């Protein structure tokens, strides 16, 4: 399962381009399930900043993608049993990704739209950096406790020669 985000100008208003878009993508055939998407206006400025953001947001994209994938791998690492239920535990806003992607909402309380694009980008980075710090701590606890219980089982395992 995948989704695409796209953007294009309106002819005189934003509606006109979407009305053409969603019709062609649904009426010629089911090319894609098609809708508007939630992105706010933000405090824009100089090209120097926008170009900085163009590469900084690419480095941040790789970072936040690495964080969310690490969380999903940690869920598979704690689910040594009930592995089939991993999709019911990896939820965003209490729903599966297919739902939250389709129904996405910008968080104006965590990310206030009056702030500069730089400030919002740093706030995202700081938030996922503490998730990455909590993941470093929780792995350092869990992996050692797991390894110790496996070594206790390895001492108990096998015949009268090994147990």
């Amino acid at each position: 399962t995948e989704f695409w985000l796209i953007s294009a100008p309106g002819e005189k208003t934003c509606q006109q381009t979407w009305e053409k878009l969603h019709a062609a993508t649904t009426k010629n055939n089911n090319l894609a399930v098609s809708s508007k998407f939630n992105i706010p206006d933000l405090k824009v400025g100089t090209l120097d900043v926008l170009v900085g953001l163009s590469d900084e947001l690419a480095k941040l994209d790789a970072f936040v993608e690495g964080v969310v994938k690490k969380v999903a791998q940690y869920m598979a690492d704690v689910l040594e049993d009930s592995k089939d239920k991993v999709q019911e535990n990896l939820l965003a806003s209490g729903v599966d990704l297919v739902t939250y992607i389709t129904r996405f909402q910008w968080d104006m309380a965590k990310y206030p739209i009056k702030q500069s694009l730089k400030n919002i980008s740093e706030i995202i980075a700081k938030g996922v950096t503490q998730i990455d710090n909590d993941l470093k701590s929780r792995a350092s606890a869990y992996n050692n406790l797991k390894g110790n219980l496996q070594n206790l089982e390895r001492k108990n395992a096998g015949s009268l020669l090994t147990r």
């Binding site: 100089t46 090209l47 120097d48 170009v51 900085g52 163009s54």
Partner: protein
Amino acid sequence: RLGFVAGVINRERIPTFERMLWRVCRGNVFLRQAEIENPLEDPVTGDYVHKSVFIIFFQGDQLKNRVKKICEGFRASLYPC
């Protein structure tokens, strides 16, 4: 502050060069190209080649570095103006 750079290259590189400018500076670079009135000699091989001039316009050092990186990519000869 607004700024610009200028230089020369073999004319056949200009189409890919301009497409790469908008590919890296996402849809946004102003520029002009001009073919030279005669070919000019290669300083190493002595090959006369139909080079073209270019001039490129932007705001700030961040865009300056991108247009420069593309010029380096095509081995274009930049000059101050």
